[PDB]
């Protein structure tokens with residue numbers, strides 16, 4: 001049993017994808033504690049239109065005011081399971097909606113979406129069915145774990161710079177003012193919880209959300225949300241073309257899933273300064289590669305993802321939170337499956353399983 005990943009198998013019409021609704025949200029504070037409210041949400045606050053072009057120093061505060069998340073901690077789905085536990089009765093969609101849903105993080109779905117074009121990084125997804133519901137939780141691959149432990153100084157600082165850019169672009173209160181003098185603490189996160197459906201696969205997933213734009217004409221989430229990105233300044237048309245083809249595909253996939261309609265990008269020069277901003281509407285990103293022989297195709301992304309969901313659903317027949325079907329994929333190969341029980345792959349915690357059982 002395996003699943004091919006070549007884009008030519010998936011090039012048909014765009015599949016059904018339900019307009020996403022936000023079911024709720026949660027926050028993680030500076031100590032990585034869960035709170036079932038929006039306390040971590042920040043508000044889009046771009047530089048005044050009448051003032052100077054941005055000149056954000058993305059290195060300011062590195063590493064002295066940097067409080068990085070401890071990446072050795074395996075959170076898996078735990079934060080999302082807690083939200084689900086705390087909202088299990090008052091869920092949308094009617095009786096047994098959760099039982100026919102697939103539950104995962106937005107970022108796991110993003111990786112599925114980009115799989116047909118991905119040439120470098122493989123993945124592993126653990127799958128457990130429990131009370132009908134299919135749960136998907138990423139497993140760090142061996143190469144990804146070594147690459148992580150040996151992360152160049154450069155990539156460590158780039159990651160800080162992405163977060164620092166958000167600090168320059170966001171305020172703690174609507175219409176408030178940004179505060180770059182503060183600490184960059186990546187334990188802090190605001191997460192949106194959404195309902196969608198791909199083909200006939202109902203979806204419940206959560207994703208980190210950078211800010212809410214109080215100037216957006218539609219105030220209903222997720223339409224009022226904005227995604228913040230940084231990227232190298234580009235000069236030649238070849239450089240923009242490469243950007244469109246590789247980077248935009250990932251930006252698209254990440255923001256398309258939860259219905260986040262705009263990505264705001266800060267382009268940074270080699271000295272670490274953002275000295276321009278560009279807005280990319282999620283629904284127009286594909287326009288940049290529509291008639292490009294080397295471009296990507298949203299239909300391919302979504303049809304492969306729908307096909308992977310059908311594959312997972314039909315492969316994972318046993319209802320058992322301690323059993324795991326591990327889906328493995330490396331560039332140039334098909335998705336394959338192995339089966340495992342209990343430690344280390346089993347990822348549904350007892351505090352979830354026991355409460356859901358009662």
Ligand SMILES: NC(=O)C1=CN([C@@H]2O[C@H](COP(=O)(O)OP(=O)(O)OC[C@H]3O[C@@H](n4cnc5c(N)ncnc54)[C@H](O)[C@@H]3OP(=O)(O)O)[C@@H](O)[C@H]2O)C=CC1
Nearest residue numbers: 069105106107108138139162186189206207208228229254
């Ligand atoms: N393989 C894993 O263990 C994963 C854990 N997660 C966790 O689950 C929750 C949902 O995250 P997501 O599904 O929104 O994740 P993704 O879309 O992959 O990333 C969105 C943002 O989440 C942040 N983020 C996500 N993962 C990490 C990380 N490992 N270390 C530090 N920051 C992280 C980051 O701001 C990133 O923004 P950029 O795409 O601009 O880098 C978060 O609390 C996240 O920590 C997510 C994906 C994969």
Ligand SMILES: [Ca+2]
Nearest residue numbers: 210227228229
């Ligand atoms: Ca971001």
